[PDB]
């Protein structure tokens, strides 16, 4: 009953099971630990970062090793459009003979790989199960390096100080230039040297790379300035990927669009992209001042940025010390940027597939988009939660105020009511009218008169599609016109490739849109606005409100303030995160439902099914869920089973976890404490069991813990059931 | 505030004509989101001068037939801009540069919240001594004449645009400018 | 809800139906209760998914009000 | 009939009467000019 | 209130029902005792319950109860 | 109502030259004339309403300051009403004629609806 | 035309939809007898369907590839009767409602028992205010000018 929460003496003195539960959930909140200083905080965070990167590299190495050992990578190379990639083998003693037979792939039961790693590794120039093994070996070596570094930087003479950790200019210069630019430069080097010849049949391994010229002229044009030579003779339109037939000699080109065979971006396009990004980031990494008297001091930049007329208060004067001294502000900024970035990855890796033969891998396309959108929602909610935490525990009004006037951040708490009221107005506006139009379509179609539907053509979005060259909406605007200056300017660089790809019905590049797209985009906007409303309200109201003008004194996460003053359930800022998680899950569900139904109709060919039935709710319920759930639920029946049996089991498992979350959310404490007391009496008053007694007094889960557990069940069930549905439906419908 | 500013005359009684009270919205709620009366008056002078110049530039070339030698002979203001933009790109570029320089030197951005060293449409610019030595009432009367002529030119240019868009919107227009 | 689900499925599968002139009994669903009501996947598929076909396909018919109330009750 | 008229002035009765009247004229507009997808003008 | 509800049920059976047609063909006519006004296209709810009648099929079993009571006329 | 009754009687009798103004029936003339002439009448009546009540046009705004005899627009160019002795009789006559004209305006409009030809 | 759509008067799928609906209604009509009310109702349904389709055809309505009228709400006055005119109508009506509600709230807010007059409406005063909302655009831009529309600093604020 002691010594487990070593970091908290208050918990270690708890005589109940709450100590164990809270010991888990407070282990990473280093700022709240006993005998805590800032130096130890930054050093522990640094070591934890090292361990985390080691974990990531070990996970990647495991994926590589299992593809190399139990996969069919080599067979998939020779026939990427017919051979289904294998993730890893299965050894489960609970299998019957039927399950073994159904999951049997080649030599052993195995799982199909939906991560798209086969296409990614094939694109970057891997052709052998020994290339994957080398990658796994190297990644385990890197993990060992990172673990050694993490141990080393906790040693006495190697523990960095607060000044080093808060040295913003040095870290920015190095991160930008070194990390981004130099990693892009090295990736361009690999892309060219290995990937470009490997796509043309020439093997460039760790033996013949110092003697195989990536370009026939060989670094002469680069120093000579004849950089056009690297773009001459690109890959033809009859080039077979991985073979020298119809190949070229160029390494950096503009082509635009996709490879005619793999239906993916040109490797020479991506090498040029990464070279340009490398140059730009290396240049941008010299901005801030270091030991050589030139550069920028960001404190001065922030302080000097006050509009002269005066509408942002005193400007950004106090922001430098605010961000530097708070790890939650930086964490929130990083999480918001990462969420936007992974939303970008999801939205671009389906419209512009970058890996060979990934466009025809429909289950992996759906899985990748869903995975990245869910990660995006999680990251955004985390960014807002950490902003709220910064408000609660790191924000100092004195730093952000100069002689009564407030800086740009402190002024966000002055018109907080205006911000929240207008977020509420936008949410109500969008919800009222999107639901009104959807229900109008529902009722009108149900009454057998679909012509009375309200169908709004998304002209604004179709205008953008025409601006990028789509000649489908008869707009003749910028790139849909051959005479506009936008078209004449790039008529010789990348329009022929771009136009040939955007004006193609088999791509996902700028999918044609209609009224259903309009309505679902408005639903998405409503979801985004409502999630933002909850999170922003929790962040701004974190330090106090009218119901609790001292909420900052109770911390970020506390159960309530009691039944007084009318009742104060879910009044903390943590509860705002807890409520906004449901809205994030709902919004990501809407986004992924829209994406998956649109792409299922596109792949099956019945795009008229979406364009007609997507305007009313029953259309969704009947033609997406009810229609495509048939292959999934018949993964095992009283007659047999298929390789989709695991997905049906996961479907039911997700439903069960969802409803257990419903348990933990609807039923609150107090009802579970008295029942536990009855159980305690029963155990204490029964023979043959009195010999065994608990060391920690069994008590009901706390209010905040119960909310967390219900949210965890809700989210896990949500994710599992939707993953099972999307994967099984795609597999069982599209062969 | 409008009682002590140039712009009102016998045509609208003796009071400043302001049906919508737009001159008094600057002092209303907000630090500044709606223009001050000084910004509105500078917009008056600028729009009126531009409208007078544009009326001359649609009347003289289009009707009288006077044209700069190496410029397109297009008696139509809806195409003359593009025609000269292609025919003499350097001339249009120099005109744009001169306009930008003139406006940047005479910047009116502190007029939005009220204030600044300049007056409403001061601009210096008295070459031929028309206001060399005059009574204050005479200068005010000349300013009022300028403002009223600018408003009239605004109305004339709006009428041009309306008749081009909606035919028959100005009945006497084609009988008062017989050529395009 | 479980009681009424049991009643509906059991009656439709093992009581209700039509009788042929020679005495052959054919039920509404066909006796699937005995073998497919013993798993949760069976309840999900052979009862909920299977018998929800009439509700979702009621649009445009005289039972469309039932589909509308289905959606509204979900809401 | 002094307190009965005050009872009819209560929020529920007034809201019920107003919503009944509102639904009434909406339903009757839609009966006399049905299937109006756009503005009649 | 209960008596008013029962009176409404009997009135609907008397005026807006196909009870007389259902009496002559209980095994082939579906009981209906509520007709729907033709507004906003909702007249599709008037189903083909049989007996030269259009309306909403009734699942409360009032027709069978009335027949068991000996009620043979509206 | 008085002006509208006189309008009926004159319209069925006199009418204006032109194809649009050729319906002896007032109800059908409301449709044949088109929206353009009617909307001009609507806007002119609005201008009159604004200028005659001098801004205060609503139930809560009018008579808020008092000093406004009900129905007293001051309109009397021909000078009938200088003598206060006949002023009360003129007011009563105007009220009675207005009420009678409301009843008659309803009567004429509904006669045109149930028959369709004219008033005669 | 706009957005690749075509007028519904020349949309073959629109006429196919009309023909299919009429055929279904006539097939339903076949199973009833003589001039009985069911046949009259089905005939009225057929007539209303034909009238609605004809009106939609002659309405400057653009139909997609599904033969359904699509709304052009980018702002152009050509299709102004689809969104813009109903938008103006709703803005007028909703501004009327909001104005009369605000006026009633502010009027009974200066009496002895403001809360009593909110559950028990002063029907005379309510009727007086409600019929005065036809000038809400003018009343709003006569109270905003006088500063009587917006509060300044008597509004309450939370602790931070
Ligand atoms: C060249 C020198 C260099 C390099 C390579 C690094 C590299 C790194 N440092 Mg580091 N550091 C440096 C110098 C350097 N540092 C110096 C000089 C200081 C002292 C001032 C520090 C202080 C420091 C601290 C205190 C910490 C690090 C950490 C890290 C690691 C970050 C985690 C990671 O793996 O990110 C990998 C990231 C990438 C490979 C690139 C990310 C790609 C992004 C997401 C895509 C963005 C593209 C685009 C913009 C998207 C938007 C679209 C656009 C249209 C807007 C990383 C390995 C952290 C860590 O984990 O420690 C172990 C940490 O806590 N460093
Ligand atoms: C007036 C002095 C002068 C001038 C005008 C040049 C001009 C040039 N030198 Mg050069 N050079 C100079 C002095 C000079 N050098 C001196 C003093 C040395 C050392 C003793 C060198 C060593 C040198 C090398 C080693 C190379 C050049 C090269 C070049 C050419 C490549 C430029 C280019 O495309 O950028 C290329 C742009 C980038 C590399 C990045 C931007 C260019 C004509 C290159 C070449 O091949 O010329 C034909 C080359 O490889 N120079
Ligand atoms: C790199 C990103 C990052 C980082 C560094 C942190 C770091 C931190 N967060 Mg944070 N957070 C993040 C992302 C991040 N978070 C995101 C994305 C969200 C939104 C979901 C949140 C939401 C959040 C909240 C709401 C809170 C924190 C808190 C904290 C602090 C303490 C963490 C703690 O006690 O862990 C405790 C760890 C746990 C309780 C483990 C939970 C594990 C979950 C339930 C998943 C495990 C189930 C697993 C999937 C099993 C699968 C089931 C199977 C059947 C399939 C710490 C500073 C807390 C704090 O006090 O901050 C000051 C706090 O209240 N964060
Ligand atoms: C289908 C279920 C459902 C529906 C319809 C709503 C609807 C709403 N929620 Mg919500 N919510 C739900 C489930 C749901 N929630 C769940 C499960 C949670 C997790 C606890 C939350 C958590 C939550 C939070 C934390 C917040 C909302 C908010 C809102 C409002 C957003 C504005 C809007 O759309 O106005 C339009 C309203 C509708 C479309 C629904 C009502 C309209 C009906 C049909 C009118 C019928 C009249 C007869 C709205 C009332 C936010 C809010 O209050 O914004 C102002 C807010 O802050 N909700
Ligand atoms: C560019 C358009 C424009 C603008 C900004 C103004 C602005 C002004 N005018 Mg002015 N005016 C204009 C055009 C304009 N006018 C034209 C075309 C005429 C001729 C009919 C007049 C005739 C006129 C008179 C007779 C008087 C003014 C006065 C004023 C001043 C007080 C009224 C006010 O605040 O209006 C602000 C106006 C706007 C912000 C313009 C909004 C226009 C909207 C978009 C609707 C336009 C279409 C209908 C102010 C500086 C009064 C003055 O000088 O007081 C001393 C005065 O007595 N003007
Ligand atoms: C971000 C835009 C921006 C800013 C902040 C400035 C700032 C300045 N300009 Mg300037 N200018 C700009 C754009 C801008 N310029 C452009 C595009 C041109 C045309 C080529 C000019 C031409 C110009 C001239 C000719 C002169 C100035 C001058 C000045 C200085 C003071 C006088 C003044 O403001 O009047 C000039 C005011 C303007 C020109 C108005 C510009 C309005 C811009 C275009 C609006 C942009 C706002 C928009 C929201 C930005 C979007 C951000 C993001 C979404 C991309 C001041 C430093 C003067 C100077 O040098 O003083 C010594 C001067 O004589 N400017
Ligand atoms: C309260 C709003 C309202 C309004 C403005 C009207 C308006 C009208 N109704 Mg009416 N009506 C209403 C509610 C309303 N009704 C209700 C609640 C019912 C009962 C369901 C009826 C039942 C009804 C019948 C039965 C008839 C009208 C008729 C009429 C019209 C002539 C009187 C007129 C357009 C008559 C009509 O025009 O039909 C030819 C007619 O015969 N109404
Ligand atoms: C909130 C979004 C929304 C919007 C914009 C509409 C809009 C519309 N619906 Mg609709 N509807 C909605 C929600 C919505 N509905 C919901 C939630 C449902 C489910 C209950 C329905 C069910 C529904 C049906 C069943 C029908 C419509 C119909 C209509 C159309 C005719 C409207 C009408 O009667 O005008 C005429 C009435 C007015 C303009 C009233 C104002 C008149 C006042 C008195 C003017 C006075 C001041 C001068 C119109 C396009 C009808 C149609 O024909 O569709 C094309 C139709 O049959 N709707
Ligand atoms: C004015 C009127 C209607 C006017 C209608 C108009 C202009 C309609 C115009 C339109 O239709 C058209 C042309 C075309 C349409 O598409 C558009 C509109 C615009 C809609 C009805 C009056 C209708 C007037 C009515 C019904 C009056 C009823 C009076 C009664 C019952 C009086 C009874 C008493 O007088 C006695 C009998 C004895 C007394 O002592 C006691 C009392 C009790 C006072
Ligand atoms: C609470 C809080 C927080 C947080 C916050 C957040 C979380 C936020 C988010 C945010 C976000 C999330 C934002 C976003 C943004 C975005 C943007 C800003 C965008 C932009 C874009 C653009 C600008 C584009 C443009 C263009 C186009 C459109 C076309 C193409 C080209 C170009 C580029 C031109 C913190 C911690 C800080 C602090 C405390 C408080
Ligand atoms: C069911 C339920 C309970 C009862 C559930 C409890 C007490 C959890 C029971 C123990 C779970 C099943 C874990 C058991 C783990 C094993 C005993 C192994 C020990 C592991 C620890 C050492 C970590 C609550 O206490 C409660 C409190 C507040 C709101 C809602 C609820 C609620 O819904």
UniProtKB/TrEMBL annotation, chain A:
Binding annotation for [4Fe-4S] cluster: 560, 569
UniProt key word 4Fe-4S: yes
The organism's place on the tree of life at top rank: Eukaryota
Membrane topology (UniProt): Multi-pass membrane protein
Binding site for chlorophyll a B1: 655
Catalyzed chemical reaction(s): reduced [plastocyanin] + hnu + oxidized [2Fe-2S]-[ferredoxin] = oxidized [plastocyanin] + reduced [2Fe-2S]-[ferredoxin]
Subcellular location: Plastid, Chloroplast thylakoid membrane
EC number of the protein: 1.97.1.12
Entry annotated with the keyword Calcium: no
Record key words, sorted: 4Fe-4S, Chlorophyll, Chloroplast, Chromophore, Electron transport, Iron, Iron-sulfur, Magnesium, Membrane, Metal-binding, Oxidoreductase, Photosynthesis, Photosystem I, Plastid, Thylakoid, Transmembrane, Transmembrane helix, Transport
Binding site for phylloquinone: 672
GO CC entries: chloroplast thylakoid membrane; photosystem I
HAMAP family: PSI_PsaB
Protein name in the entry: Photosystem I P700 chlorophyll a apoprotein A2
Primary gene name: psaB
UniProtKB/TrEMBL annotation, chain C:
Binding residue positions for chlorophyll a': 74
Top-rank taxon, per record: Eukaryota
Subcellular location(s) per record: Plastid, Chloroplast thylakoid membrane
Subunit note: The PsaA/B heterodimer binds the P700 chlorophyll special pair and subsequent electron acceptors. PSI consists of a core antenna complex that captures photons, and an electron transfer chain that converts photonic excitation into a charge separation. The eukaryotic PSI reaction center is composed of at least 11 subunits.
Family: Belongs to the PsaA/PsaB family.
Known function: PsaA and PsaB bind P700, the primary electron donor of photosystem I (PSI), as well as the electron acceptors A0, A1 and FX. PSI is a plastocyanin/cytochrome c6-ferredoxin oxidoreductase, converting photonic excitation into a charge separation, which transfers an electron from the donor P700 chlorophyll pair to the spectroscopically characterized acceptors A0, A1, FX, FA and FB in turn. Oxidized P700 is reduced on the lumenal side of the thylakoid membrane by plastocyanin or cytochrome c6.
Protein name: Photosystem I P700 chlorophyll a apoprotein A1
Residues of the full protein shown: 597 to 671 of 745
UniProtKB/TrEMBL annotation, chain D:
Record's bilayer topology term: Single-pass membrane protein
Listed Gene3D superfamilies: Single helix bin (1.20.5.510)
GO cellular component: chloroplast thylakoid membrane; photosystem I
Compartment list: Membrane; Plastid, Chloroplast thylakoid membrane
Pfam family, one: PSI_PsaJ
InterPro entries for this protein: PSI_PsaJ, PSI_PsaJ_sf
GO biological process: photosynthesis
Main location: membrane
Segments crossing the lipid bilayer: none
Swiss-Prot/TrEMBL keywords: Chloroplast, Membrane, Photosynthesis, Photosystem I, Plastid, Thylakoid, Transmembrane, Transmembrane helix
Family to which the UniProt record says this protein belongs: Belongs to the PsaJ family.
Function according to Swiss-Prot or TrEMBL: May help in the organization of the PsaE and PsaF subunits.
Name assigned to this protein: Photosystem I reaction center subunit IX
Source organism (scientific name): Nannochloropsis oceanica
Gene: psaJ
UniProtKB/TrEMBL annotation, chain G:
Segments forming a coiled coil: none
InterPro entries: PSI_PsaF, PSI_PsaF_sf
Ion transport found in the keyword field: no
Keywords: Chloroplast, Membrane, Photosynthesis, Photosystem I, Plastid, Signal, Transmembrane, Transmembrane helix
Superkingdom as given in the UniProt entry: Eukaryota
Transmembrane segments: 83-99, 119-139
PANTHER family referenced in this protein's UniProt entry, alphabetically: PHOTOSYSTEM I REACTION CENTER SUBUNIT III, CHLOROPLASTIC (PTHR34939:SF1)
Family membership noted in the UniProt record: Belongs to the PsaF family.
Protein name: Photosystem I reaction center subunit III
Organism name: Nannochloropsis oceanica
Gene: psaF
């Amino acid at each position: 009953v002691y010594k487990f929460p070593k970091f908290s003496k208050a918990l270690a003195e708890d005589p109940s099971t709450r100590r164990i539960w809270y010991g888990i959930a407070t282990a990473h909140d280093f700022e709240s630990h006993d005998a805590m200083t800032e130096s130890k905080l930054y050093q522990k965070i640094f070591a934890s970062h090292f361990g985390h990167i080691a974990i990531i590299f070990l996970w990647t190495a495991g994926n590589l090793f299992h593809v190399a050992w139990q996969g069919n990578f080599e067979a998939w190379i020779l026939n990427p459009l017919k051979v289904r990639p294998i993730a890893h083998a299965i050894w489960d003693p609970h299998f019957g003979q039927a399950a073994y037979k159904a999951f049997l792939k080649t030599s052993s039961p195995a799982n199909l790989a939906l991560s798209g790693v086969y296409e990614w590794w094939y694109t970057i120039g891997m052709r052998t199960n020994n290339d994957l093994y080398q990658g796994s070996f190297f990644l385990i070596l890197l993990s060992s390096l990172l673990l050694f570094a993490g141990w080393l930087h906790l040693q006495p003479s190697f523990r960095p100080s607060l000044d080093w950790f808060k040295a913003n200019e040095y870290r920015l210069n190095h991160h930008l230039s070194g990390l981004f630019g130099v990693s892009s430069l090295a990736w361009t080097g690999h892309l060219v040297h290995v990937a470009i010849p490997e796509s043309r049949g020439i093997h460039v391994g760790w033996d013949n790379f110092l003697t195989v010229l990536p370009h026939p002229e060989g670094l002469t044009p680069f120093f000579s300035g004849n950089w056009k030579a690297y773009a001459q003779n690109p890959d033809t339109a009859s080039h077979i990927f991985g073979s020298g037939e119809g190949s070229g000699t160029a390494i950096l080109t503009f082509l635009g669009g996709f490879h005619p065979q793999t239906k993916s971006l040109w490797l020479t396009d991506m090498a040029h992209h990464h070279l340009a990004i490398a140059v730009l980031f290396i240049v941008a990494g010299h901005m801030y001042r270091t030991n050589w008297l030139i550069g920028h001091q960001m404190k001065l930049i922030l302080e000097a940025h006050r509009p002269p007329g005066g509408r942002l208060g005193i400007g950004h004067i106090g922001l430098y010390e605010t961000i530097t001294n708070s790890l939650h502000f930086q964490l929130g900024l990083a999480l918001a940027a990462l969420g936007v970035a992974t939303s970008l990855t999801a939205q671009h890796m389906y419209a512009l597939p970058p890996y060979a033969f990934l466009a025809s891998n429909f289950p992996t396309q759906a899985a990748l988009y869903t995975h990245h959108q869910y990660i995006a929602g999680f990251l955004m909610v985390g960014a807002f939660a950490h902003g709220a935490i910064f408000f609660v525990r790191d924000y100092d009004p004195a730093v952000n105020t100069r002689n009564g006037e407030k800086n740009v951040l402190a002024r966000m708490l002055e018109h907080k009511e205006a911000i929240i009221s207008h977020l509420s107005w936008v949410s109500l506006f969008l919800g009222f009218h999107t639901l009104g139009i959807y229900v109008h379509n529902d009722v009108v179609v149900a009454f057998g008169q679909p012509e009375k539907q309200i169908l709004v053509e998304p002209l604004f979005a179709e205008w953008i599609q025409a601006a990028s060259g789509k000649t489908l909406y008869n707009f003749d605007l910028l790139l849909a016109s051959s005479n506009s200056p936008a078209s004449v300017a790039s008529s010789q660089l990348w329009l022929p490739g771009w136009l040939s790809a955007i004006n193609d019905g088999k791509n996902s590049l700028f999918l044609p849109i209609g009224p259903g797209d309009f309505l679902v985009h408005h639903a998405i906007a409503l979801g985004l606005h409502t999630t933002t409303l909850i999170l922003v309200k929790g962040a701004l109201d974190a330090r106090g409100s009218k119901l609790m003008p001292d909420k900052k004194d109770f911390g970020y996460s506390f159960p309530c303030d009691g039944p007084g003053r009318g009742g104060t359930c879910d009044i903390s800022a943590w509860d705002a995160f807890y409520l906004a998680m449901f809205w994030m899950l709902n919004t990501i569900g809407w986004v992924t439902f829209y994406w998956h139904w649109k792409h299922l109709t596109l792949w099956q060919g019945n795009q008229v099914q979406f364009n007609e039935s997507s305007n009313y709710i029953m259309g969704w319920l009947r033609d997406y869920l009810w229609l495509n759930s048939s292959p999934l639920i018949n993964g095992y029946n009283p007659f047999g089973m298929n390789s989709l049996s695991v997905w049906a089991w996961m479907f039911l498992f997700g439903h069960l976890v969802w409803a257990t979350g419903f348990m933990f959310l609807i039923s609150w404490r107090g009802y579970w404490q008295e029942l536990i007391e009855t159980i305690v009496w029963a155990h204490e008053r029964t023979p043959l069991a009195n010999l065994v007694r608990w060391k920690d007094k069994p008590v009901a889960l706390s209010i905040v813990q119960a909310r967390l557990v219900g949210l965890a069940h809700f989210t896990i069930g949500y994710v599992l059931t939707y993953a099972a549905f999307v994967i099984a439906s795609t597999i069982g419908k599209l062969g | 505030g409008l009682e002590n500013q140039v712009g009102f005359d016998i045509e609208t009684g003796g009071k400043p004509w302001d049906p919508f009270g737009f001159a008094g919205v600057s002092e209303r709620n907000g630090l500044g989101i709606l223009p001050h009366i000084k910004w509105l008056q500078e917009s008056e002078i600028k729009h009126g001068r531009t409208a007078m110049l544009a009326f001359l530039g649609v009347i003289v070339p289009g009707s009288l037939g006077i044209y700069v030698p190496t410029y397109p002979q297009e008696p139509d203001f809806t195409k003359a801009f593009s025609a000269a933009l292609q025919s003499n790109p350097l001339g249009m570029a120099q005109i744009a540069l001169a306009v930008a320089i003139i406006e940047g030197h005479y910047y009116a951005g502190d007029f939005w919240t009220g204030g600044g060293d300049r007056q409403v449409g001061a601009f210096g610019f008295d070459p031929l001594g028309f206001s060399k030595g005059k009574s204050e009432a005479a200068i005010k009367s000349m300013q009022l004449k300028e403002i009223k002529n600018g408003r009239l030119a605004m109305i004339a240019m709006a009428a041009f645009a309306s008749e081009k868009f909606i035919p028959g919107s100005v009945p006497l227009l084609h009988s008062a400018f017989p050529t395009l | 809800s479980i009681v009424i689900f049991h009643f509906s499925w059991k009656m439709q599968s093992d009581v209700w139906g039509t009788v042929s002139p020679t005495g052959a009994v054919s039920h509404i669903t066909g006796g699937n209760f005995a073998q497919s009501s013993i798993t949760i996947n069976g309840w999900l598929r052979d009862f909920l998914w299977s018998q929800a076909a009439q509700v979702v396909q009621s649009y445009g018919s005289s039972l469309s009000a039932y589909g509308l109330i289905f959606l509204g009750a979900h809401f | 009939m002094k307190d009965f008229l005050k009872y009819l002035s209560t929020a529920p009765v007034l809201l019920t009467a107003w919503l009944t009247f509102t639904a009434g004229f909406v339903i009757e507009i839609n009966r006399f000019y049905p299937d109006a997808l756009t503005f009649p003008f | 209130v209960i008596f008013l509800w029962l009176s409404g049920m009997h009135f609907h059976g008397a005026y807006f029902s196909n009870y007389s047609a259902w009496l002559t063909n209980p095994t082939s006519t579906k009981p209906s005792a509520q007709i729907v006004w033709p507004i906003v296209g909702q007249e599709v709810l008037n189903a083909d319950v049989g007996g030269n009648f259009q309306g909403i099929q009734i699942t409360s079993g009032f027709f069978q109860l009335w027949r068991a009571e000996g009620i043979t006329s509206e | 109502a008085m002006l509208a009754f006189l309008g009926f009687i004159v319209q069925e009798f006199i009418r204006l030259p032109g194809d649009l103004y050729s319906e002896p029936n007032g109800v059908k003339a409301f449709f044949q004339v088109g929206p353009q002439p009617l909307l001009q009448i609507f806007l002119f009546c609005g201008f009159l309403e604004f200028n005659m009540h001098k801004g205060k046009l609503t139930q809560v705004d009018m008579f808020e300051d008092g000093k406004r005899e009900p129905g007293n627009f001051g309109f009397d160019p021909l000078g009938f009403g200088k003598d206060p002795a006949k002023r009360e009789r003129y007011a009563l006559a105007e009220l009675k004629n207005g009420r009678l004209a409301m009843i008659a305006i309803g009567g004429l409009v509904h006669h045109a609806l149930v028959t369709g030809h004219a008033t005669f | 035309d706009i957005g690749g759509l075509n007028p519904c008067k020349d949309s073959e799928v629109f006429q196919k939809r009309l023909a299919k609906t009429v055929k279904k209604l006539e097939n339903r009509l076949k199973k009833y007898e003589e001039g009985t009310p069911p046949q009259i109702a089905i005939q009225q349904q057929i007539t209303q369907t034909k009238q609605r389709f004809t009106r939609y055809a002659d309405s400057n309505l653009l139909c997609g590839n599904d033969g359904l009228p699509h709304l052009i709400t980018d702002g152009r006055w050509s299709h102004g009767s689809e969104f813009l005119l109903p938008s103006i109508l709703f803005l007028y009506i909703s501004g009327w409602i909001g104005w009369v509600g605000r006026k009633y709230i502010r009027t009974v807010g200066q009496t002895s028992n403001p809360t009593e007059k909110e559950i028990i409406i002063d029907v005379p005063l309510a009727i007086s205010i409600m019929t005065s909302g036809f000038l809400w655009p003018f009343a709003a831009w006569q109270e905003f000018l006088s500063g009587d529309l917006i509060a300044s600093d008597e509004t309450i604020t939370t602790s931070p």
